[PDB]
Amino acid sequence: ERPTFYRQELNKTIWEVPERYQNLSPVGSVCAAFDTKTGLRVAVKKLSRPFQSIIHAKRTYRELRLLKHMKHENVIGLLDVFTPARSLEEFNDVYLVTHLMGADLNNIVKCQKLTDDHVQFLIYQILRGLKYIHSADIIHRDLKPSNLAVNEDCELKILDFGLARHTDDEMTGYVATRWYRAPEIMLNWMHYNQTVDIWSVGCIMAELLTGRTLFPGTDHIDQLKLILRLVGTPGAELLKKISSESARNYIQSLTQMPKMNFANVFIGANPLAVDLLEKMLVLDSDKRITAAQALAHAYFAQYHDPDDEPVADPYDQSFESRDLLIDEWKSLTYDEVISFVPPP
Numbered sequence: 001e002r003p004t005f006y007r008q009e010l011n012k013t014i015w016e017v018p019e020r021y022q023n024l025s026p027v028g029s030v031c032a033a034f035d036t037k038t039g040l041r042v043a044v045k046k047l048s049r050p051f052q053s054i055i056h057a058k059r060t061y062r063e064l065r066l067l068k069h070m071k072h073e074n075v076i077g078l079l080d081v082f083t084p085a086r087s088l089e090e091f092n093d094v095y096l097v098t099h100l101m102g103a104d105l106n107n108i109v110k111c112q113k114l115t116d117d118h119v120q121f122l123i124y125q126i127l128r129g130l131k132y133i134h135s136a137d138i139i140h141r142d143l144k145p146s147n148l149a150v151n152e153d154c155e156l157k158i159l160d161f162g163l164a165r166h167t168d169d170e171m172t173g174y175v176a177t178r179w180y181r182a183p184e185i186m187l188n189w190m191h192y193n194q195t196v197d198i199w200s201v202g203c204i205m206a207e208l209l210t211g212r213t214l215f216p217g218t219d220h221i222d223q224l225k226l227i228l229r230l231v232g233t234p235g236a237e238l239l240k241k242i243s244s245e246s247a248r249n250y251i252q253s254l255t256q257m258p259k260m261n262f263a264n265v266f267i268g269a270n271p272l273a274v275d276l277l278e279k280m281l282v283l284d285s286d287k288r289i290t291a292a293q294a295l296a297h298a299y300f301a302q303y304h305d306p307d308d309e310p311v312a313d314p315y316d317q318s319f320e321s322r323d324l325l326i327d328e329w330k331s332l333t334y335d336e337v338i339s340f341v342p343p344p
């Protein structure tokens with residue numbers, strides 16, 4: 001039951017995949033392919049140098065554990081994972097397979113004000129996957145239009161959840177990479193939690209409604225100023241919670257500003273959209289609406305269905321606090337590769 005693999009050069013590299021996968025074409029490097037066993041269009045990712053350091057070995061493991069866990073319509077999961085290796089000692093490459101969606105939320109929306117129902121449907125799907133992700137005590141933490149995979153039927157899957165990898169230069173300047181980040185994680189105010197993802201959803205939703213980036217900061221400080229101008233400066237209760245004395249000290253230097261009226265910012269928008277944005281874009285993370293609570297909000301009355309909004313089984317991330325050697329991460333990775341059961 002080891003399938004027959006065939007070799008092929010794509011993306012300056014030798015892809016060796018089971019015969020079931022045909023018509024590979026570039027799109028880790030990623031190829032679109034046709035899965036002859038399932039009839040599905042699939043995306044196949046070949047990891048580069050998954051075991052070159054302790055840090056990458058753990059990342060590879062992390063990515064696989066994460067992708068193996070997610071079984072939800074609005075979250076990218078695994079149809080397949082394989083390696084051409086026949087044993088651990090020759091194990092070297094990992095290939096991950098999921099549904100081909102073919103575009104991201106930008107390749108559809110950037111500089112476009114969309115209809116209220118399209119916004120309803122896209123945001124409902126994001127919140128629906130987020131409830132599922134968050135129920136597993138997993139934090140996406142870098143949610144943004146380019147991490148939302150979307151096909152022609154406006155069906156949406158969340159990508160790249162749970163990886164905490166972005167370098168400082170990637171976050172610097174007038175860059176999309178920081179514009180959807182919650183202030184408390186942007187400026188490292190505190191050991192953050194899952195409510196940071198709801199901040200990102202509000203940023204995305206606002207942009208779908210107006211056709212414009214909500215907080216297009218030119219640097220971290222410019223972006224903070226844009227945020228506080230909309231949502232107000234921190235009150236006393238929130239200040240305490242900023243465990244970062246340096247951060248706290250800077251915020252207290254700022255002229256106090258009241259929260260703006262959202263109905264005058266998002267002129268013409270559905271009042272239920274505005275109301276929901278007000279519950280999403282709250283400075284104090286403790287008081288933000290959660291994914292579960294938002295799904296029950298009147299804005300989504302057309303799509304909401306409490307019997308089809310599943311939660312996840314618990315996700316054992318005890319491994320995150322574990323120090324291991326490269327080859328122990330590799331062995332754990334191999335185990336997960338070889339224990340994989342495909343879905344129905």
Ligand SMILES: Cc1ccccc1-c1c(N)c(C(=O)c2ccc(F)cc2F)cc[n+]1[O-]
Pocket residue numbers: 027030031043044045067076077078096097098099100101102103104148149150159
């Ligand atoms: C979002 C997107 C836009 C254009 C082309 C492909 C894709 C795309 C991917 N990059 C990916 C993708 O990056 C990916 C993630 C996990 C995995 F196991 C395998 C994968 F190929 C998945 C699906 N699609 O549709």
